[PDB]
């Protein structure tokens, strides 16, 4: 069966910079997948369990952050990476979750929520609001 | 510092028989300090940190046809390529690296083409044509027919 | 309650000589409990609270040409119209009401057209063609050429 | 001289519903104007001083709200109207600021900020971050 993850973005802090998506990737396991946009939300559709995709964001102050979401052994997972250099594109980071690329262990945690504060003080949270089944939903919150 | 390059793409869809294409993935290669995609006035701009990198848009139609368009700058001149007939697992993340490190598509990048045309096995024609083909603020049309 | 109607529009731009059109305004008329525009998969959907209302997209090209497309449902059947040659102050807010209350364009609404074609004075052709022309979930192509 | 107003939307409350734009209008004085979208912001460009435009938003919980922005006698103005019925479209509300339509006095205040809490508890703020000149900028904040 196919899986989808639908993300809505909440930006809450008017002092730390405004974020926009600068890249969207899909990993090639499980027959791949695609991003789409509807009603102000972003949906990743995947061919089955065992793959993922990523949104990279950049702020008006030049801060670069990636959000990864996917399904591992039929359960959702997520991660956020901050403090990225300009050349650390999503194309670089998304593969790091597979083939013992350094971040596999995070995917294997199957997290339904994750939060981190960047070194320059930006907090990012991913929280699944629908955390079971094939039509998953999560909020991405910048603060 | 290094000179930055931007490529701005506008999409023309002309043939209802091909179904309707939408973007399903946007990648940026990591050479030359990377880069970012942005959207404005219905156009898509890839901004890059220097000559020697690229990015890709993958499209999928309402009929399930998957096609990638790659654009970049090689030795200070624009390049482009179109790949059709893609399998569901042949994502832009798979294809974009193939232009580098002798990955199978370096040759077309090295041609520094200002236009590219191909017809897919199922009859969809795709053209990339640069309308501003020189300098640091490049512009091209992507045409489905 | 009342039956709702939706109209989903996809835009095809085919001729680079016309410049490139983008949406500059989106309106909804207030009869039949109003309605809303939404965007998904690169298509534009007008959802309405009943038969007897409409909405409009106004487009402007990179060459400054302004054109409106109106779609709605009249007596349970779809309708459409295209107005070209618009002055800068002839916004969709001015034009959408003209289809009602004997405002000058009621006649075309009452025709319940499933297709419309016009060529502007400066040579831009615009077509609206419904591909799903019956029922409550209607679909049309808007074609610039 | 032409005027522009660029708006960025901040949604901060994950419990009260997610908003999206459902209508965008431009008033016909001062040679009219146009909306555009870039970098996740919304820009209203106007032919001169003396006109305005509006964004209408609807939440996932069915709440309908309009935000009006414009320039009156060379100074920015704004307003927010909440508790709207489905048939109170932007096409209905935008004209109410002119021709003694009931809301002219709000436009004439030339506000650089405005906030209101709807009857069902949603707070909306418009705050100009660039409040002078021809290239104005404001945040629209839902909370």
Task: Write out key terms for the chains shown.
4-stranded antiparallel β-sheet, 2 helices, homotetramer, Mutm (Fpg) Protein, Chain: A, domain 2, 6% helix, mainly beta
Characterise this structure.
Four copies of one chain form a homotetramer. Chain A is mostly beta strands and 143 residues long. The first copy, chain A, has a single domain, classed as Cytolysin/lectin (Mutm (Fpg) Protein, Chain: A, domain 2). Chain A contains two helices and ten strands. At the A-B interface, strand 2, strand 3 and helix 1 of A face strand 2, strand 3 and helix 1 of B.
Radius of gyration of chain A: 14 Å
**Overall SS class of chain A:** mainly beta
State the fourth-level CATH superfamily of chain A: Cytolysin/lectin
Question: Helix content range of the residues of chain A, please?
Answer: under 10%
Main sheet overview of chain A: 6 strands, mixed
User: Within the largest sheet of chain A, what's the order of strands?
Assistant: 3-4-1-10-9-8
Query: Strand tally of chain A, please?
Result: 10
CATH class of chain A: Mainly Beta
PDB class: sugar binding protein
Keywords: fungal lectin, sugar binding protein
Assembly: tetrameric
Entry title: X-ray crystal structure of Xerocomus chrysenteron lectin XCL at 1.4 Angstroms resolution, mutated at Q46M, V54M, L58M
């Amino acid at each position: 069966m196919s899986y989808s993850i639908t993300l809505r973005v909440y930006q809450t802090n008017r002092d730390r910079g405004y974020f926009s998506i600068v890249e969207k990737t899909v990993w090639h396991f499980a027959n791949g997948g695609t991003w789409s946009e509807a009603n102000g939300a972003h949906t990743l559709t995947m061919g089955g369990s065992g793959t993922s995709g990523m949104l990279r964001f950049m702020s008006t102050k030049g801060e670069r952050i990636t959000v990864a979401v996917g399904v591992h052994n039929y359960k959702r997972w997520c991660d956020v990476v901050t403090g990225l250099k300009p050349d650390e594109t999503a194309l670089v980071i998304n593969p790091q979750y597979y083939n013992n690329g350094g971040r596999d262990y995070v995917r294997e945690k199957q997290l339904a929520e994750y939060s981190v504060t960047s070194a320059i003080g930006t907090k990012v949270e991913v929280v699944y609001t629908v955390a079971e089944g094939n039509n998953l939903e999560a909020n991405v919150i910048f603060s």
